[PDB]
């Protein structure tokens, strides 16, 4: 292995473009749709990226509705979608130019939803417990 | 492998020997011999059984030093040595030929003076 220069060189990395880092930021050029393989059938959204390191890329959009367009700053997760080819990475929500998924109040951590003002009843003890 | 200082030039190959550390008197010599533990036999009994060119030699030296020094200077010791060792055999078989003429010239007089 050549992209990898630490640890077990014999191990093929699980995110090659993203590399050693845990995340990396980029900018969209264009959005797309990609079909899955034959056992399934759907239209899963995809979002190109150029990274700061000048590397082309594709990425996944988990949220139902999305704010994505051209010239949007995005942050990558590295995980991926399974059925799709070339989509072994995935974007992160609640960051520079995405939006919290909407009309949603479950699994509020993956999608970036903050906690609503109803469920919370008390403040943190640094001010007015 | 190491290189060792023997003062008397006393040891040969099979002689098994203790060696000890000394400060370096030269490069690659920081050991000397202390003692032979087991000897190995010698080649002394067999070793005991075992001139005009000096005017040939001393010329051939002076030939090349006059030529070489003008043509190519000291610059490299490799040139200083690879020449000489390779030039003498080129010189000696020519300098032997200078003396072989002597046996020829002296007799061609006697052959002409006698008859």
């Amino acid at each position: 292995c050549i992209n990898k220069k630490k640890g077990n060189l014999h191990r093929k990395l699980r995110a090659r473009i993203l590399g050693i880092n845990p995340q990396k930021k980029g900018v969209v050029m264009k959005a797309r749709i990609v079909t899955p393989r034959k056992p399934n059938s759907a239209r899963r959204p995809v979002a190109k990226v150029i990274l700061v390191n000048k590397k082309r890329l594709t990425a996944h959009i988990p949220g139902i509705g999305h704010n994505i367009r051209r010239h949007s700053s995005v942050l990558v997760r590295g995980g991926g979608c399974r059925d799709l080819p070339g989509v072994r990475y995935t974007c992160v929500r609640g960051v520079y130019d995405f939006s919290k998924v909407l009309n949603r109040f479950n699994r509020r951590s993956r999608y970036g939803i903050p906690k609503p003002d109803e469920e919370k009843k008390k403040l943190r003890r640094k001010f007015r417990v | 492998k190491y290189q060792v200082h023997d003062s008397e030039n006393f040891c040969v190959t099979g002689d098994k020997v203790v060696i000890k550390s000394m400060l370096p008197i030269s490069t690659m010599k920081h050991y000397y011999v202390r003692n032979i533990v087991k000897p190995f036999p010698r080649d002394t009994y067999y070793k005991e059984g075992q001139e005009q060119l000096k005017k040939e030699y001393q010329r051939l030296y002076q030939e090349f030093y006059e030529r070489e020094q003008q043509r190519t200077e000291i610059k490299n010791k490799k040139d200083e040595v690879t020449l000489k060792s390779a030039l003498k055999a080129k010189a000696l078989t020519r300098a032997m030929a200078n003396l072989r003429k002597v046996e020829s010239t002296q007799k061609k007089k006697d052959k002409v003076v006698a008859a």
């Binding site: - | 190959t13 099979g14 087991k38 190995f40 067999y46």
Partner: protein, 179 residues
């Protein structure tokens, strides 16, 4: 095989060792013809043959013999010289002498029949095996090593290992590993 190679490794440019002194082969060939012209077969002597007729002698004479028989005389001719005890046949001094008489034949066989590839591999073994007994005999009876190499026109080149691993190798010294 063994080459001039002072390091642990064995290169292409390194040259093989010398089997004979300069003009060692021809001197030995001359010795044979002297034997071939004035000798009889191995087992027989001239004293036993003097009553018998010439027709019996010329048959036993070694001119008419085969090279496989020409050696048998030369071998026993050597055994009487280079033995340690009576009826000695296998000691080191003799074993080297046997290969020297073969090399005289293999070369003649290989210079002539060049395509006998199996023979070309056989030289490399004789030399190597000669090169071993030639060393083991230095180590044990050095004053017999020289009394052989003169007769058979052999050079006195010691081994580069220095007889290190056969002789008195022991207690090999202590050091420590770290990091």
């Amino acid at each position: 095989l063994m080459t001039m190679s002072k390091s642990g490794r064995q290169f292409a440019r390194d040259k093989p060792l010398e089997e004979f002194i300069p003009k060692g082969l021809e001197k030995l060939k001359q010795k044979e013809q002297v034997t071939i012209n004035t000798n009889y077969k191995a087992g027989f002597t001239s004293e036993e043959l003097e009553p018998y007729n010439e027709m019996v002698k010329r048959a036993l004479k070694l001119n008419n013999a085969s090279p496989f028989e020409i050696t048998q005389f030369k071998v026993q001719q050597a055994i009487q010289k280079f033995k340690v005890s009576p009826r000695d046949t296998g000691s080191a001094a003799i074993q080297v002498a046997v290969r020297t008489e073969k090399l005289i034949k293999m070369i003649k066989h290989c210079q002539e029949n060049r395509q006998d590839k199996y023979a070309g591999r056989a030289l490399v073994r004789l030399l190597e095996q000669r090169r071993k007994w030639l060393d083991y005999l230095r180590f044990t009876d050095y004053h017999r090593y020289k009394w052989i190499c003169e007769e058979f026109c052999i050079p006195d080149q010691p081994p580069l290992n220095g007889h290190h691993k056969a002789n008195f190798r022991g207690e090999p010294n202590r050091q420590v590993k770290t990091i």
